[PDB]
Tab-separated table of all heavy atoms in Angstrom:
chain	number	residue	atom	x	y	z
G	49	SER	N	-16.660	-37.896	-32.329
G	49	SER	CA	-16.502	-37.490	-30.981
G	49	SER	C	-15.210	-38.022	-30.321
G	49	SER	O	-14.574	-38.977	-30.877
G	49	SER	CB	-17.667	-37.997	-30.130
G	49	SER	OG	-17.577	-39.442	-29.949
G	50	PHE	N	-14.845	-37.543	-29.143
G	50	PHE	CA	-13.817	-38.186	-28.311
G	50	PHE	C	-14.202	-38.144	-26.860
G	50	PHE	O	-15.083	-37.354	-26.471
G	50	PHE	CB	-12.461	-37.545	-28.666
G	50	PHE	CG	-12.227	-36.150	-28.047
G	50	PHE	CD1	-11.683	-35.960	-26.790
G	50	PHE	CD2	-12.595	-35.035	-28.757
G	50	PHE	CE1	-11.505	-34.657	-26.219
G	50	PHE	CE2	-12.383	-33.744	-28.274
G	50	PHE	CZ	-11.862	-33.606	-27.055
G	51	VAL	N	-13.446	-38.845	-26.064
G	51	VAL	CA	-13.841	-39.056	-24.630
G	51	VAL	C	-12.573	-38.774	-23.714
G	51	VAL	O	-11.513	-39.239	-23.989
G	51	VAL	CB	-14.475	-40.434	-24.390
G	51	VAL	CG1	-14.451	-40.672	-22.866
G	51	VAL	CG2	-15.854	-40.482	-24.957
G	52	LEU	N	-12.834	-38.055	-22.647
G	52	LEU	CA	-11.774	-37.935	-21.585
G	52	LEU	C	-12.460	-38.321	-20.328
G	52	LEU	O	-13.333	-37.706	-19.774
G	52	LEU	CB	-11.320	-36.557	-21.565
G	52	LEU	CG	-9.762	-36.260	-21.407
G	52	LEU	CD1	-9.053	-37.027	-22.469
G	52	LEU	CD2	-9.468	-34.783	-21.516
G	53	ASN	N	-12.008	-39.449	-19.702
G	53	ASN	CA	-12.481	-40.032	-18.456
G	53	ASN	C	-11.570	-39.825	-17.324
G	53	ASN	O	-10.352	-40.095	-17.439
G	53	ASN	CB	-12.803	-41.485	-18.657
G	53	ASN	CG	-14.031	-41.779	-19.483
G	53	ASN	OD1	-14.912	-40.970	-19.647
G	53	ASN	ND2	-14.040	-42.945	-20.114
G	54	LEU	N	-12.037	-39.230	-16.209
G	54	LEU	CA	-11.226	-39.071	-15.011
G	54	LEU	C	-11.978	-39.596	-13.827
G	54	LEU	O	-13.164	-39.387	-13.614
G	54	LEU	CB	-10.969	-37.629	-14.792
G	54	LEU	CG	-10.374	-36.820	-15.987
G	54	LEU	CD1	-10.324	-35.345	-15.681
G	54	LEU	CD2	-9.007	-37.329	-16.317
G	55	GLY	N	-11.228	-40.289	-12.916
G	55	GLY	CA	-11.749	-40.823	-11.668
G	55	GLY	C	-10.795	-41.731	-10.972
G	55	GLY	O	-9.604	-41.617	-10.949
G	56	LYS	N	-11.431	-42.772	-10.355
G	56	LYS	CA	-10.707	-43.813	-9.699
G	56	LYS	C	-10.327	-44.936	-10.638
G	56	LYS	O	-9.182	-45.386	-10.622
G	56	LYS	CB	-11.488	-44.341	-8.431
G	56	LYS	CG	-10.779	-45.449	-7.672
G	56	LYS	CD	-11.743	-46.040	-6.681
G	56	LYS	CE	-11.185	-47.319	-6.074
G	56	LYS	NZ	-12.124	-47.914	-5.090
G	57	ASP	N	-11.279	-45.419	-11.389
G	57	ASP	CA	-11.121	-46.414	-12.405
G	57	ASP	C	-12.210	-46.318	-13.395
G	57	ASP	O	-12.970	-45.362	-13.384
G	57	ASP	CB	-11.053	-47.789	-11.726
G	57	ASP	CG	-12.231	-48.136	-10.846
G	57	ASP	OD1	-13.426	-47.544	-11.099
G	57	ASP	OD2	-12.084	-48.745	-9.827
G	58	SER	N	-12.259	-47.320	-14.340
G	58	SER	CA	-13.268	-47.293	-15.401
G	58	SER	C	-14.650	-47.350	-14.968
G	58	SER	O	-15.644	-46.997	-15.691
G	58	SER	CB	-12.945	-48.487	-16.412
G	58	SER	OG	-13.337	-49.705	-15.722
G	59	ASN	N	-14.864	-47.748	-13.663
G	59	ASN	CA	-16.207	-47.806	-13.144
G	59	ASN	C	-16.549	-46.645	-12.231
G	59	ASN	O	-17.684	-46.443	-11.829
G	59	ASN	CB	-16.375	-49.133	-12.387
G	59	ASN	CG	-16.525	-50.349	-13.215
G	59	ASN	OD1	-17.281	-50.376	-14.185
G	59	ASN	ND2	-15.805	-51.388	-12.872
G	60	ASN	N	-15.585	-45.815	-11.961
G	60	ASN	CA	-15.798	-44.652	-11.078
G	60	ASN	C	-15.134	-43.408	-11.603
G	60	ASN	O	-14.002	-43.150	-11.429
G	60	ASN	CB	-15.253	-45.013	-9.649
G	60	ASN	CG	-15.933	-46.131	-9.015
G	60	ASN	OD1	-16.949	-45.951	-8.381
G	60	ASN	ND2	-15.374	-47.327	-9.136
G	61	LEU	N	-15.982	-42.671	-12.432
G	61	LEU	CA	-15.527	-41.466	-13.134
G	61	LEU	C	-16.204	-40.267	-12.418
G	61	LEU	O	-17.498	-40.258	-12.435
G	61	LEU	CB	-15.850	-41.524	-14.519
G	61	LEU	CG	-15.335	-42.753	-15.295
G	61	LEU	CD1	-15.927	-42.760	-16.728
G	61	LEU	CD2	-13.839	-42.877	-15.263
G	62	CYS	N	-15.380	-39.370	-11.903
G	62	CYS	CA	-15.926	-38.086	-11.395
G	62	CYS	C	-16.178	-37.078	-12.490
G	62	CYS	O	-16.767	-36.004	-12.333
G	62	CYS	CB	-15.042	-37.537	-10.286
G	62	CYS	SG	-13.432	-37.196	-10.933
G	63	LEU	N	-15.571	-37.453	-13.685
G	63	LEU	CA	-15.870	-36.689	-14.829
G	63	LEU	C	-15.692	-37.475	-16.144
G	63	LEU	O	-14.611	-38.028	-16.469
G	63	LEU	CB	-14.941	-35.478	-14.973
G	63	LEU	CG	-15.108	-34.606	-16.267
G	63	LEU	CD1	-16.539	-34.026	-16.282
G	63	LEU	CD2	-14.031	-33.533	-16.403
G	64	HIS	N	-16.747	-37.544	-16.927
G	64	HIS	CA	-16.768	-38.190	-18.258
G	64	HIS	C	-16.920	-36.948	-19.244
G	64	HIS	O	-18.003	-36.401	-19.376
G	64	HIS	CB	-17.954	-39.132	-18.383
G	64	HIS	CG	-18.168	-39.595	-19.837
G	64	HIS	ND1	-17.330	-40.509	-20.482
G	64	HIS	CD2	-19.171	-39.295	-20.624
G	64	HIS	CE1	-17.829	-40.703	-21.692
G	64	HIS	NE2	-18.870	-39.980	-21.812
G	65	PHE	N	-15.845	-36.596	-19.829
G	65	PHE	CA	-15.786	-35.513	-20.766
G	65	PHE	C	-15.854	-35.942	-22.212
G	65	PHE	O	-14.932	-36.562	-22.815
G	65	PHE	CB	-14.466	-34.705	-20.454
G	65	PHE	CG	-14.392	-33.450	-21.323
G	65	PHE	CD1	-15.067	-32.320	-20.959
G	65	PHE	CD2	-13.550	-33.369	-22.434
G	65	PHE	CE1	-14.947	-31.170	-21.611
G	65	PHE	CE2	-13.421	-32.153	-23.177
G	65	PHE	CZ	-14.127	-31.024	-22.782
G	66	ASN	N	-16.974	-35.574	-22.863
G	66	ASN	CA	-17.337	-36.202	-24.109
G	66	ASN	C	-17.884	-35.178	-25.122
G	66	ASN	O	-19.097	-35.020	-25.346
G	66	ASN	CB	-18.391	-37.326	-23.929
G	66	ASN	CG	-18.800	-37.990	-25.239
G	66	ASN	OD1	-19.911	-38.466	-25.403
G	66	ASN	ND2	-17.914	-38.045	-26.117
G	67	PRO	N	-16.924	-34.413	-25.781
G	67	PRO	CA	-17.241	-33.558	-26.870
G	67	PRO	C	-17.793	-34.365	-28.027
G	67	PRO	O	-17.109	-35.214	-28.565
G	67	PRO	CB	-15.959	-32.897	-27.276
G	67	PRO	CG	-15.112	-32.981	-26.025
G	67	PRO	CD	-15.506	-34.296	-25.399
G	68	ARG	N	-19.043	-34.085	-28.505
G	68	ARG	CA	-19.637	-34.753	-29.674
G	68	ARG	C	-19.800	-33.817	-30.851
G	68	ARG	O	-20.639	-32.895	-30.794
G	68	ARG	CB	-20.971	-35.387	-29.276
G	68	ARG	CG	-20.867	-36.263	-28.056
G	68	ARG	CD	-22.168	-37.071	-27.732
G	68	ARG	NE	-22.001	-37.860	-26.559
G	68	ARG	CZ	-22.973	-38.540	-25.998
G	68	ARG	NH1	-24.250	-38.466	-26.492
G	68	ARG	NH2	-22.772	-39.328	-24.923
G	69	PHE	N	-18.956	-34.087	-31.876
G	69	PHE	CA	-19.036	-33.306	-33.113
G	69	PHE	C	-20.248	-33.819	-33.969
G	69	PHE	O	-21.063	-33.027	-34.335
G	69	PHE	CB	-17.815	-33.595	-33.932
G	69	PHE	CG	-16.563	-33.133	-33.180
G	69	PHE	CD1	-15.923	-34.054	-32.289
G	69	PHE	CD2	-15.972	-31.920	-33.433
G	69	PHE	CE1	-14.791	-33.700	-31.636
G	69	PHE	CE2	-14.855	-31.553	-32.784
G	69	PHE	CZ	-14.235	-32.418	-31.870
G	70	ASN	N	-20.281	-35.115	-34.259
G	70	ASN	CA	-21.462	-35.745	-34.841
G	70	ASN	C	-21.600	-37.146	-34.288
G	70	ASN	O	-21.163	-38.136	-34.852
G	70	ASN	CB	-21.197	-35.937	-36.373
G	70	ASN	CG	-22.469	-36.597	-37.139
G	70	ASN	OD1	-23.262	-37.302	-36.546
G	70	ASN	ND2	-22.415	-36.473	-38.410
G	71	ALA	N	-22.334	-37.230	-33.181
G	71	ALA	CA	-22.464	-38.510	-32.614
G	71	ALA	C	-23.636	-38.672	-31.674
G	71	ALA	O	-24.001	-37.729	-30.975
G	71	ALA	CB	-21.235	-38.911	-31.862
G	72	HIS	N	-24.256	-39.835	-31.603
G	72	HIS	CA	-25.419	-40.091	-30.831
G	72	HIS	C	-26.493	-39.089	-31.106
G	72	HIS	O	-27.194	-38.607	-30.166
G	72	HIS	CB	-25.092	-40.190	-29.344
G	72	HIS	CG	-24.030	-41.107	-28.927
G	72	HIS	ND1	-24.348	-42.460	-28.714
G	72	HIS	CD2	-22.696	-41.048	-28.717
G	72	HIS	CE1	-23.253	-43.074	-28.345
G	72	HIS	NE2	-22.256	-42.201	-28.378
G	73	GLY	N	-26.586	-38.665	-32.339
G	73	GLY	CA	-27.622	-37.659	-32.736
G	73	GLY	C	-27.266	-36.226	-32.281
G	73	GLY	O	-28.063	-35.348	-32.440
G	74	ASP	N	-25.987	-35.999	-31.773
G	74	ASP	CA	-25.661	-34.724	-31.251
G	74	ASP	C	-24.574	-33.981	-32.081
G	74	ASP	O	-23.753	-34.599	-32.773
G	74	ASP	CB	-25.082	-34.938	-29.816
G	74	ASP	CG	-26.223	-35.106	-28.855
G	74	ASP	OD1	-27.112	-34.233	-28.814
G	74	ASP	OD2	-26.175	-36.032	-28.036
G	75	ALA	N	-24.571	-32.643	-32.019
G	75	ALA	CA	-23.754	-31.837	-32.792
G	75	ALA	C	-23.091	-30.681	-31.977
G	75	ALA	O	-23.841	-29.966	-31.287
G	75	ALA	CB	-24.421	-31.264	-33.972
G	76	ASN	N	-21.840	-30.541	-32.216
G	76	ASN	CA	-20.988	-29.537	-31.461
G	76	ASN	C	-21.474	-29.319	-30.003
G	76	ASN	O	-21.770	-28.187	-29.588
G	76	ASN	CB	-21.126	-28.232	-32.195
G	76	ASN	CG	-20.371	-28.245	-33.532
G	76	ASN	OD1	-20.134	-29.346	-34.085
G	76	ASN	ND2	-20.125	-27.140	-34.135
G	77	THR	N	-21.637	-30.431	-29.284
G	77	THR	CA	-22.110	-30.381	-27.883
G	77	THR	C	-21.160	-31.219	-27.035
G	77	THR	O	-20.735	-32.273	-27.349
G	77	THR	CB	-23.551	-31.019	-27.792
G	77	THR	OG1	-24.414	-30.241	-28.609
G	77	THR	CG2	-24.048	-30.998	-26.366
G	78	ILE	N	-20.742	-30.532	-25.903
G	78	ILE	CA	-19.922	-31.167	-24.918
G	78	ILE	C	-20.888	-31.802	-23.868
G	78	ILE	O	-21.690	-31.152	-23.250
G	78	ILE	CB	-19.033	-30.219	-24.153
G	78	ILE	CG1	-18.169	-29.443	-25.209
G	78	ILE	CG2	-18.152	-30.973	-23.156
G	78	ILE	CD1	-17.025	-28.670	-24.578
G	79	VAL	N	-20.749	-33.146	-23.740
G	79	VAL	CA	-21.580	-33.770	-22.716
G	79	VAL	C	-20.652	-34.190	-21.653
G	79	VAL	O	-19.573	-34.789	-21.829
G	79	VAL	CB	-22.474	-34.920	-23.273
G	79	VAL	CG1	-22.994	-34.587	-24.691
G	79	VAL	CG2	-21.661	-36.256	-23.338
G	80	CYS	N	-21.076	-33.989	-20.345
G	80	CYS	CA	-20.326	-34.372	-19.228
G	80	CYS	C	-21.208	-35.263	-18.312
G	80	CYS	O	-22.463	-35.058	-18.330
G	80	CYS	CB	-19.726	-33.248	-18.375
G	80	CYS	SG	-19.070	-31.937	-19.438
G	81	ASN	N	-20.639	-36.231	-17.689
G	81	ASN	CA	-21.423	-37.107	-16.765
G	81	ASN	C	-20.425	-37.739	-15.742
G	81	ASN	O	-19.202	-37.645	-15.876
G	81	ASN	CB	-22.076	-38.118	-17.458
G	81	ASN	CG	-23.340	-38.667	-16.725
G	81	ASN	OD1	-23.367	-38.481	-15.540
G	81	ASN	ND2	-24.213	-39.507	-17.429
G	82	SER	N	-20.953	-38.316	-14.732
G	82	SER	CA	-20.189	-39.010	-13.733
G	82	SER	C	-20.560	-40.512	-13.909
G	82	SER	O	-21.634	-40.929	-14.505
G	82	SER	CB	-20.473	-38.552	-12.325
G	82	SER	OG	-21.791	-38.641	-11.984
G	83	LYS	N	-19.726	-41.413	-13.382
G	83	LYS	CA	-20.037	-42.787	-13.255
G	83	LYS	C	-19.728	-43.355	-11.874
G	83	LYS	O	-18.565	-43.309	-11.474
G	83	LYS	CB	-19.370	-43.685	-14.359
G	83	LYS	CG	-19.812	-45.069	-14.494
G	83	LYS	CD	-18.875	-45.930	-15.394
G	83	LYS	CE	-19.389	-46.171	-16.681
G	83	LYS	NZ	-18.840	-47.267	-17.383
């Protein structure tokens, strides 16, 4: 997997962009979240 974080700082992400190839039990899945 790899991660692309966007926001104000490491504690404030308006987009956590996390394509998971083989990770956290996940396959070929893009997971997005905020922080």
Side-chain angles (χ1 to χ4, degrees):
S49 74
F50 73 93
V51 166
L52 224 54
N53 290 330
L54 308 174
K56 179 188 169 182
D57 53 34
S58 71
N59 285 313
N60 297 275
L61 310 172
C62 60
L63 178 64
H64 170 74
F65 184 77
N66 182 210
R68 306 186 179 175
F69 303 83
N70 179 335
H72 303 277
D74 280 311
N76 294 16
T77 301
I78 307 196
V79 322
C80 318
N81 204 346
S82 56
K83 191 192 254 197

